[PDB]
Amino acid sequence: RIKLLLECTECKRRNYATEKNKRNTPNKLELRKYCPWCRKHTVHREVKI
């Protein structure tokens, strides 16, 4: 609705760690990186709504 939206980010399915980045103009691209708790760091990613 409001151009910013919450997104909770995902690693590669198995559990995750969250936090906004919006929505607005730049559409469906969504990737980043970010280090979880499954394993230790390793790549993580994004995904998810």
Place this chain on the structure above:
Amino acid sequence: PKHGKRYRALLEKVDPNKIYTIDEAAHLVKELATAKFDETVEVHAKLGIDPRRSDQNVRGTVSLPHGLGKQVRVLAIAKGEKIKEAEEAGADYVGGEEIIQKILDGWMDFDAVVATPDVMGAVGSKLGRILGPRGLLPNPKAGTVGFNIGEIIREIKAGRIEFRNDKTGAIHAPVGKASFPPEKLADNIRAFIRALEAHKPEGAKGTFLRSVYVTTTMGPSVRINPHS
């Protein structure tokens, strides 16, 4: 009321009330027509699914060697000792890259395709307009792709047996002629619908075994019983 078929005469032996039982049903499919060669027993089946989703599709096969030397034509390409395996393990039709050329011009006398790992880029790229979505593409679960070419070939004329679904969901297999014992025929059926459990897509449910049946290839047919 009377049906304009002389097969009505033959229909006297063709009285498909009870689905029957497998030895005995095999006796019925023996007891269909008897003129040109042995009565042409040819298994088929189908089931309840949602074809337009691509997700439920499978089309496999596995070794059932038997004394049937004629089912599922398959071009069986190879390069060397593997050619020896093809030619001696007994396909009725085998060739190499040159036969792929004969196909590249326009030719078609085999039902499916299998080959050695070495050429698979070729058959898997050059023939895409040749094969289409017709299932001529060799498929690792279809007993095709890999070094496993040769042993499966001896099945085409002994006990090939393979599956196939699509946009109509019908499926097929070999089982044996008419003058075939019942200890081997029935076993080929039990194991084939053990194979039907072996290849049920998992999103559809219910009474998945809706039908199992046998059309003699140009002539009389018998829904065999998929149970006893």
Place this chain on the structure above:
Amino acid sequence: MKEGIHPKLVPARIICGCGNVIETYSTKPEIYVEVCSKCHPFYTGQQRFVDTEGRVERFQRRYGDSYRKGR
């Protein structure tokens, strides 16, 4: 007890909380009623060796005149 049955005997009390639900799907129901209420039976009957009535109630009438026809 004149709105009881006779083969059995029946006249019960009530409260009637209305109000929402939506329990097992979301929040929790609204409720707001302390209203006491009546909740009750019925009448009708038949014949002796000529000359009767009965009163009775519903299920125990199928049962009822079964019985009493059985004399």
Place this chain on the structure above:
RNA sequence: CCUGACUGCGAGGCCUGCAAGCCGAGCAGGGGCGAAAGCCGGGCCUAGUGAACCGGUGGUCCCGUGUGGAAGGGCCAUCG
């Protein structure tokens, strides 16, 4: 060129009736960056936000009213 718009933590404090509010070196984790020191746990700062309660989803696998499951709840995240 990437993601440190990181998890685990926090000595010490500013403020302050309470709850809030805000700053934090330093250590482990595992990274980004330059060759290296050294930097980085959001934005140059001061507004852009809300206690609880009851629920929502995804985990954890903690409990699971005789024993075993499960319903159900808790704890983690996180939304109305």
Place this chain on the structure above:
RNA sequence: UUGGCUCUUGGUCGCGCCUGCGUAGGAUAGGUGGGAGCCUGUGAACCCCCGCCUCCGGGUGGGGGGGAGGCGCCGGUGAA
């Protein structure tokens, strides 16, 4: 509590083979898939009544007039 009976229809899913026209296609072949053919009690597929149902033949089916054929394959046109 409250019955009968009659007429109805609408729906539901199979069943009865009761159907399949882009195009080309010895033709109006849903497809999947099967493999190179099956009957004569009408000994006929020649026509000879009628019918099924039609956006033509049609595909389909009872009548026989009975005199060993009829269609498919191969072919071949096809996206099969």
Place this chain on the structure above:
RNA sequence: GCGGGGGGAACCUGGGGAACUGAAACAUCUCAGUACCCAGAGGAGAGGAAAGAGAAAUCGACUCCCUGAGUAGCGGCGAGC
């Protein structure tokens, strides 16, 4: 020929059953199954031999006193119960 018939300070059981207030307003809730109305029995009443209790292959009619415990708990998870 039997019996009921009514009357009782308080107590009891059943059939009915309320608001002020309490929540610093207020309906869910509480005051409260109270007060009170009526029916009924008695010198006591009901209760009462387990289609129980609940965790021990244990207990063993019920009522009453203590403690359990203001815990387990139920709640605009607020009052409070």
Place this chain on the structure above:
RNA sequence: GCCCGGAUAGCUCAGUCGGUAGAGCAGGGGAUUGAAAAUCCCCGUGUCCUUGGUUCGAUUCCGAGUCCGGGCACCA
């Protein structure tokens, strides 16, 4: 947030439930009409939701999304 239904031509809209994409309005072109209207005739705008998919292919059928459209459901 659930089920529905919706991105076909200038407009609003056909849509064999897979081989073709077009209808009233709308323009303009032209004719006669007293003149404007009205008459009547005629050439035009396209993946047919962006996309795949099953199939031989795709307005058509699967679907993911999409976004609008309506309705429902909303005890913090």
